[PDB]
Amino acid sequence: GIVEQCCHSICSLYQLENYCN
C-alpha cells in the first residue's frame, strides 16, 4: 500500500521501491 503506509504513517523509500513498474 502507499497511502496506508505513507499517509497513515511515515514512508522511508524502500516501501515505494516496490511500486516502480
Added chain:
Amino acid sequence: EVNQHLCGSELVEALELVCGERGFFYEPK
C-alpha cells in the same frame, strides 16, 4: 529523524525518484 507522513504530493516526488524514467502506479484521484 526525517520521519513524517508523505501525503498530498511529497509522496509522488519521492515515488518518481525511486523508480526512474519508468513510472509508478500512484494517482488515487
